[PDB]
Design an enzyme around this catalytic site. Sequence first.
Site, PDB file in Angstrom:
ATOM      1  CG  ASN A 252       7.229   0.427   3.455  1.00 18.49           C
ATOM      2  OD1 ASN A 252       6.763  -0.538   3.209  1.00 18.49           O
ATOM      3  ND2 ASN A 252       8.569   0.353   3.709  1.00 18.49           N
TER       4      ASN A 252
ATOM      5  CB  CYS B 241       5.253  -6.138   1.065  1.00 20.78           C
ATOM      6  SG  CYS B 241       5.916  -7.766   0.251  1.00 20.78           S
TER       7      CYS B 241
ATOM      8  CD  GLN C  48       4.622  -5.661   5.481  1.00 20.68           C
ATOM      9  OE1 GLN C  48       4.814  -4.738   4.691  1.00 20.68           O
ATOM     10  NE2 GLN C  48       5.216  -6.690   5.368  1.00 20.68           N
TER      11      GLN C  48
ATOM     12  CG  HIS D 118       8.668  -4.291   0.459  1.00 18.53           C
ATOM     13  ND1 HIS D 118       7.487  -4.993   1.257  1.00 18.53           N
ATOM     14  CD2 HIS D 118       8.628  -3.056   1.016  1.00 18.53           C
ATOM     15  CE1 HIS D 118       7.110  -3.889   1.987  1.00 18.53           C
ATOM     16  NE2 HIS D 118       7.699  -2.912   1.962  1.00 18.53           N
TER      17      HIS D 118
END
Length: 215
Positions: A182, A25, A19, A162
């Site tokens: 992630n 996120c 990202q 997040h």
Amino acid sequence: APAAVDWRARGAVTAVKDQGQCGSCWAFSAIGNVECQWFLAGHPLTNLSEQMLVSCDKTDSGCSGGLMNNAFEWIVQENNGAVYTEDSYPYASGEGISPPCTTSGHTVGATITGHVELPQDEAQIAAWLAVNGPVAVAVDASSWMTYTGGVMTSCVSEQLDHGVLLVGYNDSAAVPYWIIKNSWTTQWGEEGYIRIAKGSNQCLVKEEASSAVVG
């Protein structure tokens, strides 16, 4: 539910993304979930466009944050369910500034019809994930910057800040854990994944779990 699940074993999860410096996120979490649900509905695994959301979903706040549930609603209510391919709408926010939305020149890679919001209950989230696939979750990731591996037992758990993607769990380990994708490259964590302890609401993981629906 099964003792352990990992949707990577089905080939249902795209590669770990980056990202960058954008607060997107929420978009990586939502899109990662859509990618998995689209594959699991019987379609080729396809990289889909976070940039579509970051630029075009005005109910969320681009590089200043957002909510996966809002993103799912925007897709269905404002974009006719369509999610463009990453190839046709590539990420352009890595430096921290999202470009304006463009409506032309993109290719539809998936369609969703709605989304579900799951109970605030780790066992029920796990049972749902075991059958229906990866789940978008909000977590407190404020303590995660220097994670390099292991089962994080140490999560601050103060404020959701997040969005990430649950892809599996292992209830058989001495400290049971979730397996989380992630969006901070494969150089972070365990090739871009993190394991957090399961059963004590670590990182507030149970609080805001959801999934897009394909079909």
